[PDB]
Every structure is written in structure tokens, then in C-alpha cells.
Amino acid sequence: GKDRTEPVKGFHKAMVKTMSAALKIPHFGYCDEVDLTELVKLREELKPIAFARGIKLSFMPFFLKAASLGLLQFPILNASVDENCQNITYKASHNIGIAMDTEQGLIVPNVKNVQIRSIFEIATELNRLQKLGSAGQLSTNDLIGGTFTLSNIGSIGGTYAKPVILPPEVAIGALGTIKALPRFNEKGEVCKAQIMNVSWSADHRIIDGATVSRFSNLWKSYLENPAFMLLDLK
């Protein structure tokens, strides 16, 4: 009825500080659309195997593994920079953060070493981080060491977005809602295509547009043609 004023208190303090720190990073946005039809079908095919094994199989495990595969080719996107971008540290480990909101705000735990983990393992670690995350039970280790972040806004809504890079990282993707839209196939006939938008933000002080674009294409070729991931997995 009247205006209420309140302290930003406690845990809400971290977001203020994280997001303010991101003012120092000149964001270059790059977006695309990804045709996820073959992926949607694929997820359906593996749904029963993963249920049998006790896991719920979402799309994220696929996005994560493709991102990682992509980071092998473009390792500069899995790097950090110092106070004034004097120096860059390339990080061997793909510790990929998953953005979450809680009643206490923004939390980003990461799956460690995605580069040596299978899609099934990634699914398992996601379930774990999510359960812990919703019980307020994430460890310090779950939160530190993140090298790269994906944010599935698409689980609530949206198409395109402009996500905020988390210092000290240099890049973040936001995934929008998967939507059936009319699109042409190779014969030029109108099909049902499952279309997802992706939006990357990159620190343009050390990531040029070709890097992020080509990374995006590789990420996207992997998801549009899942079998392509098969080639180099062991």
C-alpha cells in the first residue's frame, strides 16, 4: 500500500557483487538458432534406458558435452583473464557451470571435468547438483573452479537473451525454449522442426567474433547431427 525500503542482506549480497564485477567485461553477444529435431527424437530413444538406470535425462547433458567438445577446439573460451586483461590462463579442466535461481538467488555450481565424462555421467552429476542446489546443500567444491557457464532459461521461457559473464570466466551461453516451427527441409517442403535459440556473451577483450561464432557452429553441428559426437568419444 505504501513504499517499503529494505536492506539487500546476506546471500543476496553475492549477486550484487558478481554482477557489478561483470561491468568490467565488454560483452559481445552472438546468437543463433539450432535445429534440435534429431536431438529431440534421440532424447526420446534414450529416455527409457536412463529411467531404468535411475536418471532423468534432460537436454542439458547433451548441451554440456557438445560445449565441452567445442572447447577442445577453441580452448580460449575456457580461460580467465587478470585485473586488466594483462594475462590469460587457459584452463585444462572443463568445469561447466549451470546457472540456477533459488529463493536465496543466483547459484552456479559446475560439473567438473566434463571433458572426461560421458553424457550419462553428466546427467547423473546434474541430478546431484540440482537436488543439492534445491536443498541448500551445495558444497564449497561444487561452487568453486567454474571455467564456463550454461544457463537454461529455456526451462522457463524465452527465445534469445543477453546473459552476464561471471568473472573470472570469459563466456556464457543461454538456451531458450525449444519450439516447433515451420521450416524447409532439403526438398524445399515445409516441415515440423524443433528449434532452439542459443545466445552467447563473450569478453571481447580477448575473444573475437570468429572464435565465438565458429565455436557456436561446432557446438551446433554436434547437436543437430548427434552422431557427429560419436566420432571422437572413447
Task: Please identify every residue annotated as catalytic.
Answer: 204, 208
Minimum CB distance to Cl ion smaller for 55 or for 166:
166
Backbone φ, ψ for residue 190 (5° rounding): -70, 115
- CB-based closest residue to Cl ion: 26
> Is residue 26 close enough to count as binding Cl ion by CB under 5 A?
yes
Pairs from 173-177 (Cβ < 8 Å, separation ≥ 24): 173/63, 173/67, 173/149, 173/198, 173/199, 173/200, 174/150, 174/198, 174/199, 175/59, 175/63, 175/150, 175/151
Q: Has 87 been labeled as part of a binding site?
A: no
The option from Cl ion, ligand CO6, a copy of itself, none interacting with 19 (CB < 5 to 8 A, set by class) reads a copy of itself
> Is residue 209 close enough to count as binding Cl ion by CB under 5 A?
no
Q: Has 20 been labeled as part of a binding site?
A: no
> Is residue 60 close enough to count as binding ligand CO6 by CB under 6 A?
yes
Cell numbers at 162, concatenated: 543477453
What DSSP character marks residue 46?
A: H
> Is residue 219 close enough to count as binding ligand CO6 by CB under 6 A?
no
Pairing of strands 171-175, 79-81: unpaired
Which one-letter amino acid corresponds to residue 174?
A
Q: In this chain, which of 177, 211, 213, 221 binds ligand CO6, going by CB under 6 A? A: 177
Residue count at the site for ligand CO6 (CB under 6 A)?
A: 10
The interface region with ligand CO6, picked from 69-77, 150-158, 197-205, 206-214 by CB under 6 A, is 150-158
* Spatial distance between the Cα atoms of 56 and 154, rounded to a whole number of angstroms: 17
Q: In this chain, which of 152, 197, 199, 201 binds ligand CO6, going by CB under 6 A? A: 152
Nearest partner of 212 among 172, 177, 178, judged by Cα: 172
Applying CB under 6 A, the residues found at the interface with ligand CO6 are 58-60, 126, 152, 154-155, 175, 177-178
Instruction: Please state the residue numbers annotated as binding site for CoA.
Output: 43, 58, 101, 130, 151-152, 155, 176, 178
Sites of contact with Cl ion (CB under 5 A)? 26
